[PDB]
Amino acid sequence: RFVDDYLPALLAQASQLIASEFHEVARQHGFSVSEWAVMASLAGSEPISIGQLAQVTVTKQPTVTRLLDRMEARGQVERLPHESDRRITLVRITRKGLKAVEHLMELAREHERRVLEPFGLRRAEELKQTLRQMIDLHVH
Amino acid sequence: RFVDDYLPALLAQASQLIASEFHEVARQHGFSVSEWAVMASLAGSEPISIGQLAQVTVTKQPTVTRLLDRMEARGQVERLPHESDRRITLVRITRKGLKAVEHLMELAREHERRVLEPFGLRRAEELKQTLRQMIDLHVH
């Protein structure tokens, strides 16, 4: 059976199943999936470009721009000029956004800990290191 | 930075980046992403339910049903009654579909081998085993 060990299918199924579990929690706390992805991606971060945010949230750039229009209207994020290049808009989470998502982030950590507990610390760390290395090799 | 080591974000980014690389090849061979996902998921498989196909292709069931309507019209797949329960439709790839996707599947194997080569056989096998175990623990 081709798909049983095919890496892209394994990554896609694992990603969807784990993410869907936490998205239920996010929505019961009043967050859309994309709002949660943006705020979690910006929390504890220096300002990053719209393109970087689109990559780390796995969201198309025009979609991200529309999302930021409304999240900025609500005071949860702020767009800023890049200090040097003007073709570049940076974005950051505001204090309002951070306080809004703080509790959800703790719940997200608890859920991740539950997901990784059966694998043990060594296998969990190996998985995260491999995923990080793969991202850094394949990002454009 | 919360998102740098957050498992769902790592899985989602790795999945998207690797998949996007191969989707380019699929489209240059005349396949849509969803057509490729269905045919690759059915290749070498016994007939599976529409729900199982939706899970393994990470596609909503109504979307899968519409896709199968047109792929069955083109003779690439076939829907069948389940032998016992009638609330269940099974689906299989036809010989026409298998021959259509054979070369693409070889290219997919070559691409996966390229993606996994820098990690070595041990780390690649560890990744695939962990992903498989996670899927089997979280599928419903």
Numbering used by the authors:
A (entry chain A), B (entry chain A): 10 to 149
Reproduce, without paraphrasing, sentences from the article in which this PDB structure was first reported.
We characterize the binding of IAA to MarR-family regulators from both iac and iad loci. Most characterized MarR-family regulators function as repressors by binding to an operator sequence upstream of the genes they control. When a relevant ligand binds the MarR repressor, it releases from DNA, allowing gene expression. The structures of MarRs from representatives of each auxin degradation operon type establish that each has distinct IAA-binding pockets.
